[PDB]
Amino acid sequence: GTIDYQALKRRHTPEAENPAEADLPQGDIEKQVAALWQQLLSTGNVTRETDFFQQGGDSLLATRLTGQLHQAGYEAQLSDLFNHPRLADFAATLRKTDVPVEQPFVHSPED
Incomplete structure (x- = not known):
């Protein structure tokens, strides 16, 4: 009773018109x-x-x-964070780094 808001969960932001929702x-x-x-x-949730x-x-x-990003296999630098402050914009500049490869899945060295 007392107008149950349980069903009324309809926010629906058409576009990112203000940095909060649709972000x-x-x-x-x-x-x-x-x-x-x-x-x-x-933080609660960075957008x-x-x-x-x-x-x-x-x-x-x-x-x-x-x-943490190095360990994720992405090269992350201070320069990339100052050049790309935005989350999605920094996620755009990330390259797949070749990890140290502790287990050579396919890499035969010279004996």
Whole structure:
């Protein structure tokens, strides 16, 4: 009773008309970058148009954060975070790094 709002969950934002809703990160890379930013920045949910440094990010914090991305197999630098503050824009500039490869899946060296 008392007008049950349980059914009334219809927000529906047509477009990103204000950085809040319709800002949900779309893609595996956007979610990889989002998840790791939500740990180091210690946020509820960083969105696609969230800027790292404004969201409680620092150059020092960035030095730590790039680390998780290295382990994810993406080359992350301080220069890339200052050049690409936006989440989706930084997720766009990430290249697949060749990891150290502890288990050579297919790599025969010379005896």
